[PDB]
DNA sequence: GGCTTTCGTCAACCCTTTGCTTATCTTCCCT
């Protein structure tokens, strides 16, 4: 069942995001849920405490399931109910917190901003799906919440072999020449 | 009263070395440097794991990277710098409120111990853990403001006193205890041998090719900037029981020996940092010890 | 008429190569623009572009997994837990010599600038990495477009940085087109309300998702013309290149 | 009350052979060192098997790195330089507690028995492994401090009193029960005859294109460090029905019999320390075994 | 009334194994 789960998940802390400093540092929990970005094709996380959930029938936590075949937007666009919508976005939320993430210095003009970097869930998700699925091996693989990473994020507790990120090496200057 | 800790208050890395290079030398000419290759090698070996009886019999295969001294250099030359950077109470992320009243607590720390302590670390060969010990000679060259000195036998286990290290010292807790930066560039020179095996700064990563991973810098051997760093810390002779110098930590905390020295019995960073904001009489060693820990710099979450 | 001053061979170790959340290795072009907007405020001398270029590269780990940092037990109130082993957060390191290469506009002699970037140098800090070594910076400036690529040339040898673009996204054409991601600056999320746990409680701030571009490593004698490799601070809170996109 | 071992308890190395270099040598001409240089042949002979006999009459060719004695010099030499640290109860990665008290449970380890085995090993010729067959004579020459040893005629399978490695075992020990380190210069002069082949360690390969793939040291044939530390801790007597050395394991296993000789049985090391921390009182040749193992290194938890 | 310590809570993977680029060079001319 699909409105079992998310009042599953609103029992609990109940927090849907698109970005967040957890993937920066586990003892973070700021997670930010983005508006704009939300296409058909964006891949969506979400945080309980220690990943907690009940599973369904076929073994999948809300993760699998709103995850696939553009599930979590049919439930934005609300061709499964405007009910629903309202169950979603109340796990849709802004939780915000600055500590133990990086914070520079951004020029504006004529000043800065102190812009706190945190990361995309989209690109984590989409981007371990897709360079995978298109077997782009110029990469590094991390695993992100640690030993267990259950207390981390559902999608660090779900894909427990590491996300793909860029192997951002330069070409090398041969010093015999 | 009561002056709280910011809940997210941090200090910069006073003391930054650079990554060790590993070159091979002759004792008698030791400006033949050659980069120290990482070969790797694959070992045939049993596996005794604590939990194996049942497959102790049959055999264990490992791809390692190892380090030697070619057969025709018997001196292991060690190359870094050390920086040590001044500031060493301007927090970057704390308030101007504790980080303030944790400074002017702090001028009564007597920089030349720390210095001399830093400095003894660098030339005794505290940085070279492994590869220290079976050297039949080790000569530290300590290169300063174009001017150079020269250190044969240092035990490094305890700080004796030596004018060399300590007139070093007093342009480092000049630097310390003041502004600006100075660098030493050091040179060690260890007699290890003929082909002897080199130690240079292993790699904490997931590798499936190799189960020992050594770390290169263009194939040549070389150690972790951190790692020396440690070892440039490695001072604390002032905690609880204290026998032998562990690095300067928050919580006085080696997790290689899985002991914690100055957790739980309020002496670490934290309890004397907050005594010393708080207006409580530090003493003079605790007084050092979080001068050092300023000068290691951290973030401290709380 | 243009003025620059080259830092050549910057080998800097221990770099934070962590550049975002999907990009791991060289340090992106916000790095190196905020490092020229720091000695625009520790030297005074006021940086409009820096063009680096790495001569040197390695990620610390192997070739699919970075090695990660051993932490330190640092934080506040988690004593008991000291004596066992720190929690790692994601921080790869990374080695790099570097080629970097500032506009700059001056008005005295040569010395005092080159003595001005040597004491901020020595007192930098090459994306959170000690700069172990550096040449003597040399002053060198472009009157014409000749003397454009005078400048250009004299950052030998080095593989500089030069836009190319997002067609669609990044995944996609990183792997169609084969150019490198890197951080081109940063996409505003919501303004930040609590100024208590930040470096200034004045300055206003915004949480951010890096956004990318995409680009490639030319050396720069190859680079046909030097203004696309330059990077500075665009006016769309990101960097970019004087020259646009390279083709 | 049971003092688990730590889970990360693991004791470095502290006998350090390099890799022995194979040189020739005449027995007067000893002065006269060539390397032995590793050569490539191919080699055709039947295709054995013991299952796919149907296959037998087809030919089988294989490339063999070989190493040969040349047929001007008679002699094989070996060079290698054995380290000998001390400190061999401080573990680098679990002291404390366990490690500590295996300490004070080991105190007082016949450490003269343990160095003479050792250099016994290093002295009856054991390092050498398979060239040991056809040499007429095995003199080894080990330079200790500046102390030219000379040996003829040891036999291996027993450890004979003699005077001259209990000379060389007095210092050994008295670096193993201590602290310092001592180097032994090793030099084996076999008269295997003129053109004899000699065999050195041959390298684990897993992308073949080649049988037999000899360990070299810029072309000349040597031998891996861990053959001949091998060959030096074979001075295991002390399993259970033992009539041959073997070597030191945590588990006594040896890989070419595919058994383990100490373990199944309660006289496997991690036993033999669970019972040492815990005030079990372990005979004599169970502290060697021990401390044996301490020496050779090795990680014991989990 | 927080506050700091330690113990209990909640989990579960599908992996792949080098290039990225690839270096700053002589015609006229007259002194």
Redesign the pocket.
């Given at each position: 069942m699909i409105k079992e789960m998310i009042e599953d998940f609103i029992s609990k802390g109940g927090l849907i995001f698109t970005h967040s400093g957890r993937y920066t540092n586990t003892n973070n929990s700021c997670f930010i849920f983005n508006k704009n970005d939300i296409g058909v094709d964006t891949k969506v996380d979400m945080y309980?405490?220690?990943?907690?959930?009940?599973?369904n029938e076929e073994g999948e936590?809300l993760w699998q399931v709103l995850n696939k075949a553009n599930m979590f937007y049919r439930i934005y666009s609300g061709e499964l109910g405007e009910e629903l919508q309202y169950l979603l976005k109340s796990c849709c939320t802004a939780k915000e917190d600055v500590t133990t993430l990086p914070q520079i210095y951004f020029k504006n003009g004529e000043g800065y901003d102190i812009l706190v970097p945190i990361g995309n869930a989209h690109n984590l998700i989409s981007g371990?799906?897709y360079?995978?699925?298109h077997?782009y091996?110029?990469?590094?693989?991390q695993?992100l919440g640690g030993s267990?990473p259950?207390?981390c994020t559902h999608a660090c507790?779900?894909?427990?072999?590491?996300f793909?990120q860029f192997?951002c090496?330069?070409?090398?200057?041969?010093?015999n020449? | 009263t009561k002056l709280?800790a910011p809940a997210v208050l941090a200090y910069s890395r006073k003391i930054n070395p650079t990554n060790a290079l590993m070159f091979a030398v002759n004792w008698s000419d030791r400006d033949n440097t050659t980069a120290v290759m990482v070969g790797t090698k694959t070992v045939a070996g049993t596996q005794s794991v604590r939990g194996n009886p049942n497959d102790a019999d049959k055999g264990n295969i490992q791809t390692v990277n190892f380090a030697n001294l070619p057969h025709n250099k018997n001196t292991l030359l060690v190359k870094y710098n050390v920086k040590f950077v001044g500031d060493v109470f301007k927090a970057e992320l704390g308030g101007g409120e504790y980080s303030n009243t944790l400074q002017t607590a702090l001028e009564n720390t007597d920089f030349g111990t720390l210095a001399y302590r830093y400095v003894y670390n660098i030339a005794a060969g505290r940085t070279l853990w492994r590869n220290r010990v079976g050297a039949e000679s080790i000569e530290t060259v300590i290169t300063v403001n174009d001017q150079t000195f020269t250190f044969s036998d240092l035990l490094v286990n305890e700080f004796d006193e030596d004018v060399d290290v300590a007139e070093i010292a007093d342009m480092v807790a000049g630097v310390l205890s003041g502004e600006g930066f100075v660098t030493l560039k050091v040179e060690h020179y260890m007699l290890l041998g003929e082909g002897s095996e080199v130690f240079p700064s292993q790699e904490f990563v997931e590798n499936?090719?190799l189960s020992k991973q050594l770390f290169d810098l263009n194939g040549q051997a070389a150690m972790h900037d951190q790692k020396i760093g440690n070892a440039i810390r490695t001072i604390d002779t002032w905690y609880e029981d204290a026998t032998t110098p562990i690095a300067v930590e928050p919580y006085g905390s080696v997790v290689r020996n899985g002991v914690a020295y100055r957790?739980?019995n309020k002496t670490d960073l934290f309890t004397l940092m907050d005594g010393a904001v708080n207006g409580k009489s530090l003493t003079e060693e605790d007084q050092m010890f979080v001068t050092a820990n300023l000068i290691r710099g951290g973030v401290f979450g709380? | 008429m243009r003025k620059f001053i080259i830092v050549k061979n910057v080998k800097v170790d221990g770099i934070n190569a962590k550049s975002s959340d999907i990009t791991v290795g060289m340090p992106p072009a916000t790095t190196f623009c905020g490092l020229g907007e720091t000695m625009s405020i520790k030297t005074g001398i006021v940086v409009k572009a820096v063009s680096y270029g790495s001569v040197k590269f390695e990620v610390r780990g192997?070739?699919?997994?970075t090695s990660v940092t051993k932490f330190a037990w640092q934080d506040?109130?988690?004593?008991?837990?000291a004596n066992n082993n720190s929690p790692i957060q994601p921080k790869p390191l990374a080695d790099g010599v570097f080629t970097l290469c500032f506009e700059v506009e001056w008005e005295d002699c040569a010395e005092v600038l080159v003595d001005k970037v040597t004491n901020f140098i020595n007192t930098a800090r090459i994306a959170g990495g000690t700069i172990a070594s550096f040449n003597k910076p040399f002053v060198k400036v472009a009157k014409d477009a000749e003397e454009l690529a005078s400048v250009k040339?004299?950052m030998?040898?080095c593989?500089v940085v030069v836009d190319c673009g997002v067609e669609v996204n990044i995944f996609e054409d990183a792997v169609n087109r084969?150019?490198?991601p890197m951080v081109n600056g940063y996409k505003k999320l919501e303004k930040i309300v609590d100024n208590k746990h930040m470096r200034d409680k004045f300055t206003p701030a915004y949480l951010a998702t890096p956004t990318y571009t995409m680009i490639?490593?030319?050396?720069?004698?190859?680079?046909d013309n030097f203004d696309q490799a330059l990077w500075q601070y665009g006016e769309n809170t990101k960097v970019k290149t004087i020259g646009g996109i390279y083709n």
């Open positions: 309980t405490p220690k990943s907690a959930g009940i599973k936590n371990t799906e360079l995978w699925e077997k091996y110029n990469t590094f693989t695993k267990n259950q207390n507790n779900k894909m427990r072999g590491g793909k192997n090496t330069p070409p090398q200057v041969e010093d020449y | 709280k499936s090719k957790a739980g709380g | 192997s070739r699919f997994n506040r109130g988690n004593g008991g837990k040339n004299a030998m040898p593989y084969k150019l490198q490639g490593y030319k050396m720069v004698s190859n680079v």
